[PDB]
Amino acid sequence: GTEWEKVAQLCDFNPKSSKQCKDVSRLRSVLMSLKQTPLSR
Amino acid sequence: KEYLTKVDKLDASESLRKEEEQATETQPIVYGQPQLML
């Protein structure tokens, strides 16, 4: 479970990236990041 | 997930196709021009 924590600490796809262009692909990526976030233990 | 969004866009395109079918069904109203009786 530590590998996911390291990957998050390195490249957490936080919803703060919404400051860029509102591209639907980036929105789906943020949604996937938010759905993967509960895996953090 | 992006492909499911594309499938939703395909459903919107099917709704637009239904709108085109409604337009085709209404076309007989425009086809009935009274100037064609001359």
Swiss-Prot record, chain A:
Source organism per UniProt: Bos taurus
Full-sequence portion shown in this chain: 188 to 228 of 228
Function (record text): Clathrin is the major protein of the polyhedral coat of coated pits and vesicles.
Family of this protein: Belongs to the clathrin light chain family.
Subunit structure: Clathrin coats are formed from molecules containing 3 heavy chains and 3 light chains. Interacts (via N-terminus) with HIP1. Interacts with HIP1R.
Entry-annotated residues carrying Phosphoserine: 29
Protein name: Clathrin light chain B
Paired cysteines (S-S): 11-21
Modified residues (N6-acetyllysine): 16
Places the protein is found: Cytoplasmic vesicle membrane; Membrane, Coated pit
UniProtKB/Swiss-Prot annotation, chain B:
Subcellular location: Cytoplasmic vesicle membrane; Membrane, Coated pit; Melanosome; Cytoplasm, Cytoskeleton, Spindle
Chain segments annotated as coiled-coil in the UniProt record: none
Domain of life: Eukaryota
Signal sequence region: none
Subunit structure: Clathrin triskelions, composed of 3 heavy chains and 3 light chains, are the basic subunits of the clathrin coat. In the presence of light chains, hub assembly is influenced by both the pH and the concentration of calcium. Interacts with HIP1. Interacts with DENND1A, DENND1B and DENND1C. Interacts with OCRL. Interacts with ERBB2. Interacts with FKBP6. Interacts with CKAP5 and TACC3 forming the TACC3/ch-TOG/clathrin complex located at spindle inter-microtubules bridges; the complex implicates clathrin triskelions; TACC3 and CLTC are proposed to form a composite microtubule interaction surface.
Function: Clathrin is the major protein of the polyhedral coat of coated pits and vesicles. Two different adapter protein complexes link the clathrin lattice either to the plasma membrane or to the trans-Golgi network. Acts as a component of the TACC3/ch-TOG/clathrin complex proposed to contribute to stabilization of kinetochore fibers of the mitotic spindle by acting as inter-microtubule bridge. The TACC3/ch-TOG/clathrin complex is required for the maintenance of kinetochore fiber tension. Plays a role in early autophagosome formation.
Free-text comment on this protein's domains from its UniProt entry: The C-terminal third of the heavy chains forms the hub of the triskelion. This region contains the trimerization domain and the light-chain binding domain involved in the assembly of the clathrin lattice. The N-terminal seven-bladed beta-propeller is formed by WD40-like repeats, and projects inward from the polyhedral outer clathrin coat. It constitutes a major protein-protein interaction node.
Family: Belongs to the clathrin heavy chain family.
Name of the protein described by the UniProt record: Clathrin heavy chain 1
Biological source species: Bos taurus
Lineage summary: Eukaryota, Metazoa, Chordata, Craniata, Vertebrata
Annotated gene: CLTC
